[PDB]
Design a binder for this molecule. Structure first.
Ligand SMILES: c1ccc(-c2n[nH]cc2-c2ccnc3ccccc23)nc1
Ligand SMILES: [Cl-]
Ligand SMILES: [Cl-]
Length: 306
């Protein structure tokens, strides 16, 4: 039927997830807009059900959408969650592939808070990239706030009751996105909370610079290319990444790269560190974001941008 999960009318296709595609849709009881992701039920790698459990585990966290429904529909499983807006990668593109210092600080502290909340619920995220952080919808209270989706790579890093941390191990697969992943991930080491925060540091520099110096590397195989990228990360000092930029961002990357494997990161310290950038620069943390000035002040538009 045109309606799935009893209550959700399917609309146009808005994206593609890992395995199936993503549609927008409407709750036919209240009109609330939703995103609906499909996954072939007889598929080699199952993740949608785990994503639902993660969303329910995270229910109530600011910036994490509600999950309303999971179930089997024909040959597929579906997951229905709140509908969101463009990703930070989309908006970065539309803004000319550079964000102002102010926008980067402001998104950075929201991203730190989001990852902190994931960590507080005993999970590491393991797939940090601008494409998985989405803003809200036009006209909504959370229109320009940062949200986090796609929990397919998330994993428990500690026991929920005892808080015993998982053991360090090596020889893990290079699952993740090479542009942003931590050095430890390149080396096949078990990921922990520090690796999510290091990937954030890479993303911050990407937004500030417009690129990272390990983009555009070539090699005959994906494995060798990931290795050259890891090699460049290991040999590029954070103050070199930070040339001409507020040095708080170098201090941040160096600090999170230094964290012990099982250590609890000082999240609020990091947020205060990046906030001091705005103090230095005589700026306010007032919510004004670069993408809000697109298209004459209208914001991003499906015709000119998307
Ligand atoms: C259920 C439904 C969607 C998703 C989802 N995965 N990746 C992006 C979205 C998404 C989530 C929310 N709004 C969006 C809007 C456009 C494109 C993707 C999304 N996950 C589970
Ligand atoms: Cl694993
Ligand atoms: Cl590249």
């Amino acid at each position: 039927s045109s309606v799935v999960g009893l209550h959700y009318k399917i609309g146009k296709k808005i994206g593609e997830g890992s395995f199936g595609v993503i549609f927008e849709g409407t709750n036919i009881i209240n009109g609330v807009p939703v995103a609906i992701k499909f996954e072939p039920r007889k598929t080699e790698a199952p993740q949608l059900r785990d994503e639902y459990r993660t969303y329910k585990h995270l229910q109530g966290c600011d910036g994490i959408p509600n999950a309303y429904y999971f179930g089997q529909e024909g040959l597929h499983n579906i997951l229905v969650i709140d509908l969101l807006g463009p990703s930070l990668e989309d908006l970065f593109d539309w803004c000319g592939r550079r964000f102002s210092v102010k926008t980067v600080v402001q998104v950075a502290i929201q991203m730190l808070t989001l990852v902190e909340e994931v960590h507080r619920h005993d999970l590491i995220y393991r797939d940090i990239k601008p494409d998985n952080f989405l803003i809200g919808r036009r006209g909504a209270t959370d229109e320009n706030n940062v949200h986090l989706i796609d929990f397919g790579m998330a994993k428990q890093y500690r026991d929920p009751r005892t808080k015993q941390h998982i053991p360090y191990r090596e020889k893990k697969s290079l699952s993740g996105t090479a542009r942003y992943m931590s050095i430890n991930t390149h080396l096949g080491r078990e990921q922990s909370r520090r690796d999510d925060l290091e990937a954030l540091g890479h993303v911050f520099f990407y937004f500030l610079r417009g690129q990272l110096p390990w983009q555009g590397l070539k090699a005959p195989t994906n494995k060798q290319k990931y290795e050259k990228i890891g090699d460049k990360k290991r040999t590029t000092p954070a103050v070199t990444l930070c040339d001409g930029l507020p040095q708080q961002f170098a201090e941040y990357l160096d600090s999170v790269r230094s964290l012990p494997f099982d250590a609890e990161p000082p999240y609020e310290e990091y947020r205060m560190l990046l906030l001091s950038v705005l103090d230095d620069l005589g700026q306010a943390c007032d919510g004004d974001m670069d993408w809000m000035h697109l298209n004459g002040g209208r914001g991003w538009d499906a015709t000119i941008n998307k």
